[PDB]
Design a binder for this molecule. Structure first.
Ligand SMILES: C=C[C@]1(C)C[C@@H](OC(=O)CS[C@H]2C[C@H]3CC[C@@H](C2)N3C)[C@]2(C)[C@H](C)CC[C@]3(CCC(=O)[C@H]32)[C@@H](C)[C@@H]1O
Ligand SMILES: [K+]
Ligand SMILES: [K+]
Ligand SMILES: [K+]
Ligand SMILES: [K+]
Ligand SMILES: [K+]
Ligand SMILES: [K+]
Ligand SMILES: [K+]
Ligand SMILES: [K+]
Ligand SMILES: [K+]
Ligand SMILES: [K+]
Ligand SMILES: [K+]
Ligand SMILES: [K+]
Ligand SMILES: [K+]
Ligand SMILES: [K+]
Ligand SMILES: [K+]
Ligand SMILES: [K+]
Ligand SMILES: [K+]
Ligand SMILES: [K+]
Ligand SMILES: [K+]
Ligand SMILES: [K+]
Ligand SMILES: [Mg+2]
Ligand SMILES: [Mg+2]
Ligand SMILES: [Mg+2]
Ligand SMILES: [Mg+2]
Ligand SMILES: [Mg+2]
Ligand SMILES: [Mg+2]
Ligand SMILES: [Mg+2]
Ligand SMILES: [Mg+2]
Ligand SMILES: [Mg+2]
Ligand SMILES: [Mg+2]
Ligand SMILES: [Mg+2]
Ligand SMILES: [Mg+2]
Ligand SMILES: [Mg+2]
Ligand SMILES: [Mg+2]
Ligand SMILES: [Mg+2]
Ligand SMILES: [Mg+2]
Ligand SMILES: [Mg+2]
Ligand SMILES: [Mg+2]
Ligand SMILES: [Mg+2]
Ligand SMILES: [Mg+2]
Ligand SMILES: [Mg+2]
Ligand SMILES: [Mg+2]
Ligand SMILES: [Mg+2]
Ligand SMILES: [Mg+2]
Ligand SMILES: [Mg+2]
Ligand SMILES: [Mg+2]
Ligand SMILES: [Mg+2]
Ligand SMILES: [Mg+2]
Ligand SMILES: [Mg+2]
Ligand SMILES: [Mg+2]
Ligand SMILES: [Mg+2]
Ligand SMILES: [Mg+2]
Ligand SMILES: [Mg+2]
Ligand SMILES: [Mg+2]
Ligand SMILES: [Mg+2]
Ligand SMILES: [Mg+2]
Ligand SMILES: [Mg+2]
Ligand SMILES: [Mg+2]
Ligand SMILES: [Mg+2]
Ligand SMILES: [Mg+2]
Ligand SMILES: [Mg+2]
Ligand SMILES: [Mg+2]
Ligand SMILES: [Mg+2]
Ligand SMILES: [Mg+2]
Ligand SMILES: [Mg+2]
Ligand SMILES: [Mg+2]
Ligand SMILES: [Mg+2]
Ligand SMILES: [Mg+2]
Ligand SMILES: [Mg+2]
Ligand SMILES: [Mg+2]
Ligand SMILES: [Mg+2]
Ligand SMILES: [Mg+2]
Ligand SMILES: [Mg+2]
Ligand SMILES: [Mg+2]
Ligand SMILES: [Mg+2]
Ligand SMILES: [Mg+2]
Ligand SMILES: [Mg+2]
Ligand SMILES: [Mg+2]
Ligand SMILES: [Mg+2]
Ligand SMILES: [Mg+2]
Ligand SMILES: [Mg+2]
Ligand SMILES: [Mg+2]
Ligand SMILES: [Mg+2]
Ligand SMILES: [Mg+2]
Ligand SMILES: [Mg+2]
Ligand SMILES: [Mg+2]
Ligand SMILES: [Mg+2]
Ligand SMILES: [Mg+2]
Lengths: 114, 118, 208, 55, 123
RNA sequence: GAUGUCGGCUCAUCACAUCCUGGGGCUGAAGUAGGUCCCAAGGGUAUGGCUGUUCGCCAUUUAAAGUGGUACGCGAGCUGGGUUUAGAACGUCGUGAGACAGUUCGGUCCCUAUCUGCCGUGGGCGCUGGAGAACUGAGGGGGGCUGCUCCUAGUACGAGAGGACCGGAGUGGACGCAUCACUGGUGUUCGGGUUGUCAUGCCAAUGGCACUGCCCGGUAGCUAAAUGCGGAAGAGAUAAGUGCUGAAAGCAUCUAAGCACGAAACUUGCCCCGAGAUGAGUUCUCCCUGACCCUUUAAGGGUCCUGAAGGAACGUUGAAGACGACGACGUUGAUAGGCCGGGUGUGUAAGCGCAGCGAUGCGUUGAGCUAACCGGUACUAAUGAACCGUGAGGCUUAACCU
RNA sequence: AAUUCCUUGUCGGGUAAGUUCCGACCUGCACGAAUGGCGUAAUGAUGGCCAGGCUGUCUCCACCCGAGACUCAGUGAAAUU
RNA sequence: CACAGGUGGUCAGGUAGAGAAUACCAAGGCGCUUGAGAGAACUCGGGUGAAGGAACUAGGCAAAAUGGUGCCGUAACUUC
RNA sequence: AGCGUCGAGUCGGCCUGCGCGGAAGAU
RNA sequence: AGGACCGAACCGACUAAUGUUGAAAAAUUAGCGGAUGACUUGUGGCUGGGGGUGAAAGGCCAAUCAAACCGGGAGAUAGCU
């Protein structure tokens, strides 16, 4: 409890930017293709955030090369090098699962300009 | 299993329980002491004491939340004008349950539940 | 030997190379030796240890005198560990989680969570019968429990409904992720038996 | 499913070996009124732990 | 998480459009194929003049699943559809010359390095 | 004066004439891979298409898809497609009623478990003074499956083609145990959106009802599809088998004496139960060190005093639980509820102001509300007692001390 | 074939695989012309077969809400023997 | 049987609705003559469900699904 | 019999007593 | 216009589950068919047991039907238990 808090807090990233559901975010992930390591960008809409301390996660949805892809990132994972908000989205809901049933013009999110 | 679960079903559905405790909370605020079954008395604490807590801060919003949860403006008025003021310095424990034996008709364990400064 | 600890809960350790190791956090406070069993007196070699801190009112006079003989404070219980051919310990010696400093794998024993009275589907992984296709009142029921006149009885050990969990379980060969002697913590990879708060007996892995 | 043989009065008695009621071990005595009561319950005159709690 | 009767999209230009898993290979009572697993397929729908025909029985490697893949940090990658790449029944080598849509790094193996090379991205 | 029937489903259990995996002899056994026989029952031992099918054929798996017994195991466990009532029709037979072990369509499957058994779980008494703990381990149960890849090694073997033993490493399938950190499901106790309607005087705001009205999310818990772990190694004694030395029988001979190997079987090793193990075990600790009189002088009986350790009861309760039980706590107190702070979830409350003709938008505002969560906190309820349990614990013999 | 024993006839179609189904063939065990033959739009809680959708039917079950089951108080059966 | 059954006629409010359907209400009438707890298995009646989607089964049995109005549009075949 | 050597028995039919293998089953 | 269509009342009873010492000696629940007609329903009437009535199932004729029920022949007879 207080013990696990302490174990968790010392592993937590200190530099996680503010983002909300509906934001376009670019997540740069470490990819080890051999022993060489490089950053691979994954850009898309944040459809879900789990706020849970060290166990925090967020789900990013992109359309890649025809196909809808979702990636659930573990926020404090060392695999996630950096997160950056590319665009602020204006949505009502915490969870944008309704975007799974939308493509193109129907899947557009209004910008939150404030 | 019911590991870590709260709330008694009391051989009712959710809508009946909610309605019953709204009535019973109204009864306790109005009369300041009621006789009921010991399990109902224990559950009633979890309904009535938050209403008294809400009633410590008099505002339109809080009166409306109290009205939403009681549906009786006599009760809301008593909460905000009397009980909240009466309990302003007390940190919880606005009620006490006193066990008072067994009901004739069904041997139900009975208790009085009262406001502590009745 | 091993040590007695407490299941604090589960978390994860992120490794630098981006692995999340699921860990059970075990609080291993000082185990104080209350009795040393020997071959002459007791017929086997063991230590009895205590851990934690029981309140005086809950310590009976029999319990108090046992602790008082050892010259240790009352802990929340007593556990024995059998001694190896070499191992020697003294009464009143405190044994810390530093014991596990060089141990790679542990066996963790606890009391499993109690499921109460469990059906055969849950308890024994029995298959359900048809939900439809005419099934009459026999969806999760166990089916046949024997043959016929031969043998004309149900065999002992027949898998049937009954109490499930709330029993001693050992999980073997769990990797020791971290021994934190300063915080009295052992981190083991993966799940161990029992609820948060329950007593755990941790021993070096028997198998290897 | 039903018996093939009438169970005996003996067997009936044996089954009822666990049916005996337990008397109240002891009644508590109110410190003020002196009334006997179930422990942790109010007295018939409405005392509890010396205090007149009901009327 | 593909089983017998699961319909899959085809992530190649072999000519198949829709294929059905008729067997999860590689063990007795094996329930499911995830990404990187070889399945037996039948072609349910194909293009007119492709390398494969409707009703042909082949192997395929599952390259995308809705259930998705887990990574060592606890992350998940999920796709909107189940897709596979058709393989020669004997050689287990890709029939098509192109790969369509993302694949995962689970395919990174001498067996499927052709798929990796042809794929438009690897996640 | 009824022993329910084919097939399926559920759940099995045994045999071994062994399907796989293990050991081995012979081979017309180069290797690989077979053939055949011996040992071996530990564990394992397909999903589908068709058909009522069992079976079978077929498709595609698998290390393998064993063969049998068990009322052709299993309907007071399920099904009811088949068989086998009454309806109807076809072919066929019959003048006909009707009939067919020909076909066709339709066609009620009851039982609240007394006993045995079995799975769980208590109460009683016992175990010799009582009590609280920790144990020993007689005995019992669980578990025991296996693929593929790589290395050894393109080595041995082979004309090539191909391609090992032995040994080692990795990674899977199936199965099992645990767990909820993760990924998710659920989440009628949390938040929100919204339709119809009724109400709270009305507006505004709310509540009821409509499957939780319909929905969208979701906390804790429970949980699998989630993720940890397991099968072993080792040891003993062996099976078939292989031998050493070795006579009887100057030789030979694995055997008669003697000695050595030898398998998933056996006994252990691993896990769980376990002293009602009445053969009732051990260890540690704790508690009680009063008077008195009878008679049936005896493990006799009763009184007066005493009431221990500890237990139980009651109460607050629990990731313990059908009830019992088990665990925590009872003011010298965090046991539960409340309360405070936090987290989490939902997603910017109400009110007010502003913009708009208005729906509505914007600001105040990531607001308000927030269960089972976390950290705290005696506000409420856990009572002073009372109750049970006693007062040094039999005889005999030995060994020691007096 | 509501008729075909042999029979899952044979050939074609559909399926990865089809004793059923559809189309044929004719070798009609044992069709056949008002105890009607062969067709036939429409109709059918009619029989058979296929497909899309759909799903806890199933892989393989999980959780939840209620009514019982369980405990307490009151009342109080039954078959059978 | 104070029994979820059966029993002809008459009357016909509001909001929504095509409606005497249906939902919510009015007038009016009722909460069904054992209750109290608990929150096991299992049964019953329901809700939701990852991935798959008939692999279930004698058989898609059951369930899930479809579902309104206006307009557009609509095949073989046909006794038109 | 083993290798002329070697110094005591050896060889295998018959009849018969008792044993041995042949000999795998399901709670 | 219609033994027309969709659909309540009304009439019915195709499927499933429940129930099977039932709430009920045939129902309940969810679905289902007909619903201006060869429809349905109230009241009364007529048909009588080898008889009736039957859009025909040996259906129905008072929870009884290959010959109702009640009383009688009657203590039928019973080489059977
Ligand atoms: C009625 C007897 C049944 C239930 C069934 C019986 O099967 C027959 O007798 C076949 S004849 C068939 C029986 C039932 C009753 C009338 C009709 C004809 N059908 C529906 C059957 C299968 C046997 C052949 C004869 C013995 C049985 C006991 C054991 C068994 O297997 C039974 C009898 C004693 C049993 O009571
Ligand atoms: K068998
Ligand atoms: K061999
Ligand atoms: K075996
Ligand atoms: K039989
Ligand atoms: K059967
Ligand atoms: K029986
Ligand atoms: K039954
Ligand atoms: K018996
Ligand atoms: K979880
Ligand atoms: K959850
Ligand atoms: K409303
Ligand atoms: K004992
Ligand atoms: K128990
Ligand atoms: K508290
Ligand atoms: K606002
Ligand atoms: K506001
Ligand atoms: K918030
Ligand atoms: K014929
Ligand atoms: K005729
Ligand atoms: K007659
Ligand atoms: Mg709680
Ligand atoms: Mg009740
Ligand atoms: Mg409601
Ligand atoms: Mg439990
Ligand atoms: Mg099944
Ligand atoms: Mg039934
Ligand atoms: Mg059922
Ligand atoms: Mg017997
Ligand atoms: Mg008998
Ligand atoms: Mg009893
Ligand atoms: Mg009999
Ligand atoms: Mg054998
Ligand atoms: Mg054996
Ligand atoms: Mg063994
Ligand atoms: Mg088969
Ligand atoms: Mg049988
Ligand atoms: Mg069998
Ligand atoms: Mg039955
Ligand atoms: Mg039976
Ligand atoms: Mg039938
Ligand atoms: Mg007939
Ligand atoms: Mg075993
Ligand atoms: Mg598994
Ligand atoms: Mg958690
Ligand atoms: Mg979720
Ligand atoms: Mg929900
Ligand atoms: Mg709500
Ligand atoms: Mg309004
Ligand atoms: Mg109302
Ligand atoms: Mg209403
Ligand atoms: Mg020799
Ligand atoms: Mg093995
Ligand atoms: Mg938030
Ligand atoms: Mg609101
Ligand atoms: Mg803002
Ligand atoms: Mg708060
Ligand atoms: Mg035929
Ligand atoms: Mg044919
Ligand atoms: Mg054909
Ligand atoms: Mg099919
Ligand atoms: Mg034909
Ligand atoms: Mg004819
Ligand atoms: Mg004619
Ligand atoms: Mg005709
Ligand atoms: Mg009544
Ligand atoms: Mg009635
Ligand atoms: Mg009527
Ligand atoms: Mg109505
Ligand atoms: Mg329930
Ligand atoms: Mg549903
Ligand atoms: Mg699903
Ligand atoms: Mg889904
Ligand atoms: Mg589909
Ligand atoms: Mg099928
Ligand atoms: Mg099948
Ligand atoms: Mg249906
Ligand atoms: Mg439905
Ligand atoms: Mg012999
Ligand atoms: Mg009509
Ligand atoms: Mg009729
Ligand atoms: Mg109906
Ligand atoms: Mg019609
Ligand atoms: Mg109609
Ligand atoms: Mg007839
Ligand atoms: Mg009749
Ligand atoms: Mg007659
Ligand atoms: Mg006469
Ligand atoms: Mg007579």
């Amino acid at each position: 409890s207080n013990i696990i808090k302490q174990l968790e807090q010392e592993q937590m990233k200190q530099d996680v930017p503010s983002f909300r559901p509906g934001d376009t975010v670019e997540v740069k992930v470490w990819v080890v293709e051999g022993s060489k390591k490089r950053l691979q960008a994954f850009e898309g809409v944040v459809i879900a955030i789990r706020n849970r301390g060290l166990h925090s996660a967020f789900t990013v949805r992109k359309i890649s090369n025809g196909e809808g892809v979702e990636r659930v990132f573990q926020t404090h994972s060392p695999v996630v090098d950096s997160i950056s908000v590319k665009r602020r989205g204006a949505v009502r809901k915490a969870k944008l699962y309704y975007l799974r049933e939308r493509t193109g013009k129907a899947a557009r999110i209004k910008e939150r300009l404030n | 299993m019911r590991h870590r679960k709260s709330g008694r079903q009391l051989n009712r559905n959710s809508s009946h329980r909610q309605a019953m405790f709204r009535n019973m909370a109204g009864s306790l605020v109005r009369h300041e002491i009621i006789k009921t079954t010991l399990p109902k008395a224990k559950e009633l604490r979890r309904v009535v004491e938050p209403l008294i807590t809400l009633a410590k801060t008099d505002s339109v919003a809080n009166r409306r939340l109290a009205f939403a949860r009681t549906r009786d403006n006599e009760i809301v008025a008593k909460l905000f004008n009397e009980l909240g003021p009466r309990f302003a310095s007390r940190a919880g424990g606005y009620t006490r349950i006193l066990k008072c034996g067994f009901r004739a008709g069904d041997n139900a364990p009975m208790a009085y539940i009262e406001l502590v400064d009745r | 030997i091993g040590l007695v600890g407490k299941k604090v809960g589960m978390t994860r350790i992120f490794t630098e190379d981006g692995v999340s190791i699921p860990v059970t956090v075990i609080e291993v406070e000082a185990n104080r030796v209350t009795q040393v069993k020997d071959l002459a007196n007791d017929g086997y070699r063991a230590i009895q240890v205590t851990t934690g801190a029981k309140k005086a009112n809950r310590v009976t006079k029999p319990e108090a005198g046992h602790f008082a003989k050892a010259g240790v404070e009352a802990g929340r219980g007593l556990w024995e560990f059998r001694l190896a051919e070499g191992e020697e310990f003294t009464v009143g010696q405190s044994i810390s989680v530093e014991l596990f400093a060089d141990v790679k794998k542990v066996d963790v024993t606890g009391t499993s969570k109690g499921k109460g009275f469990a059906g055969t589907v849950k308890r024994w992984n029995f298959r359900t019968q048809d939900a439809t296709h005419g099934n009459s009142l026999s969806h999760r029921v166990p089916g046949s429990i024997g043959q016929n006149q031969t043998p004309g009885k149900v065999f002992k050990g027949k898998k049937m409904a009954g109490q499930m969990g709330n029993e001693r379980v050992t999980v073997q060969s769990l990797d020791v992720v971290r021994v934190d002697a300063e915080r009295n913590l052992l981190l083991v990879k993966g799940a161990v038996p029992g609820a948060t708060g329950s007593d755990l007996i941790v021993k070096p892995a028997v198998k290897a | 499913a039903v018996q093939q043989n009438k169970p005996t009065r003996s067997k009936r008695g044996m089954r009822r070996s666990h049916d005996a009621l337990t008397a109240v071990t002891s009644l508590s005595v109110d410190k003020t009124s002196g009334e006997k009561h179930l422990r942790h319950h109010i007295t018939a005159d409405g005392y509890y732990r010396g205090r007149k709690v009901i009327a | 998480m593909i089983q017998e009767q699961t319909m899959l999209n085809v992530a190649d230009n072999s000519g198949a459009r829709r294929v059905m898993c008729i067997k999860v290979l590689g063990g007795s009572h094996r329930r499911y194929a995830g990404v990187g697993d070889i399945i037996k397929i039948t072609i349910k729908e194909a293009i007119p003049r492709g390398k494969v025909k409707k009703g042909d029985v082949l192997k395929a490697v599952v390259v995308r699943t809705k259930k998705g893949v887990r990574r060592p940090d606890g992350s998940v990658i999920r796709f909107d559809g189940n897709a596979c790449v058709l393989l020669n029944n004997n050689s287990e080598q890709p029939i098509g010359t192109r790969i369509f849509g993302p694949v995962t790094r689970e395919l990174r193996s001498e067996k499927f390095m052709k798929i990796i090379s042809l794929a438009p991205e690897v996640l």
